[PDB]
Coordinates of C-alpha atoms in Angstrom, one line a residue:
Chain A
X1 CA 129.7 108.0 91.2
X2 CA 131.0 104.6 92.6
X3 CA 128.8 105.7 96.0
X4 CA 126.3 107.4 93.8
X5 CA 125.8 104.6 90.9
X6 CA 125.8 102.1 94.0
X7 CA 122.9 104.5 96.1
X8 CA 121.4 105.5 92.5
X9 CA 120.6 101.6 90.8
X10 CA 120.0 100.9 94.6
X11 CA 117.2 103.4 94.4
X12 CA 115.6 101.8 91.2
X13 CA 116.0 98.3 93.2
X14 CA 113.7 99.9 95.9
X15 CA 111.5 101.8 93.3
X16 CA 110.6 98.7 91.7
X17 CA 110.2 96.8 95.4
X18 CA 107.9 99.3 95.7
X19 CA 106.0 99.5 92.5
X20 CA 105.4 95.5 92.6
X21 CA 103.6 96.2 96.1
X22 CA 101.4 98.9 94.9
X23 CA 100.5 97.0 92.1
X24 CA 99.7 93.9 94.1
X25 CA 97.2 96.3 96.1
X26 CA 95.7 97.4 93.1
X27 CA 94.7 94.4 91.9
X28 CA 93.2 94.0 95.4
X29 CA 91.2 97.0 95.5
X30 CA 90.0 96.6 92.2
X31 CA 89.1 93.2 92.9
X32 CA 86.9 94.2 96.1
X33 CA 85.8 97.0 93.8
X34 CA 84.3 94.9 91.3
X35 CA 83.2 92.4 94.0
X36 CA 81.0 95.1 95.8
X37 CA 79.6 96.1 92.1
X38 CA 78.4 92.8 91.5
X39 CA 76.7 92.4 94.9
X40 CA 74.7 95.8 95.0
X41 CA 73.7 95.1 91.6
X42 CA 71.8 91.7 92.1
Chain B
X1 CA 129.2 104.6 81.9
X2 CA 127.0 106.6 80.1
X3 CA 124.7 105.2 78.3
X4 CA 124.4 103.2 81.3
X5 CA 124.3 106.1 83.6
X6 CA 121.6 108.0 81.9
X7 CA 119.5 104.7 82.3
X8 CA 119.5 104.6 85.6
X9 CA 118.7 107.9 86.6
X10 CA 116.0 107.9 83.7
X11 CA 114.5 104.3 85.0
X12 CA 114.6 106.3 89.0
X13 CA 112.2 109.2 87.0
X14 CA 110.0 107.3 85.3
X15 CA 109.6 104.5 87.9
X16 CA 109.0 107.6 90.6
X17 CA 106.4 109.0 87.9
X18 CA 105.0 106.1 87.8
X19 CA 104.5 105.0 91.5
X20 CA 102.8 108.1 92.4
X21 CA 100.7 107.8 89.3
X22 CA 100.1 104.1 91.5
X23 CA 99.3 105.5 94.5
X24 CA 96.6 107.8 93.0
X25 CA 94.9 105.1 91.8
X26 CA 94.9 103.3 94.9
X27 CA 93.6 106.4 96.7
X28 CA 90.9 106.7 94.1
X29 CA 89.5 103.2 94.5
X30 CA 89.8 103.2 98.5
X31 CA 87.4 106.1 98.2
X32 CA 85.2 104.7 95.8
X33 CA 85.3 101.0 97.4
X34 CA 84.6 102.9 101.2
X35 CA 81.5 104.5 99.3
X36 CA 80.5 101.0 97.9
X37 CA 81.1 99.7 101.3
X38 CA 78.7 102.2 102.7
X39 CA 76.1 101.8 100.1
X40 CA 75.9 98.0 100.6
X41 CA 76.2 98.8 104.5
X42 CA 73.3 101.1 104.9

């Protein structure tokens, strides 16, 4: 509990660490994604 | 407590569901933007 609340909410901490990153790296791909589109098509 | 305690496991699940739903997408658009990459390549 007191070493399992501490570990658990320090999980979510690292989840959401975590799901910032990914999202950041979407946004990436899908920019390149759209990027390439644009080029092949003209 | 335990509202509080059911929040944080509950945040852990969905923020897990979530990230791997994340990381699909990402796998999904590094296929499709290595196929774009090829397309405009060759």
């Amino acid at each position: 509990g007191s070493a399992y609340l501490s570990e658990l909410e320090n999980r979510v901490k690292d989840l959401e660490n975590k799901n910032s990153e990914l999202e950041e790296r979407l946004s990436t791909l899908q920019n390149e994604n759209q990027m390439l589109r644009h080029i092949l098509k003209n």
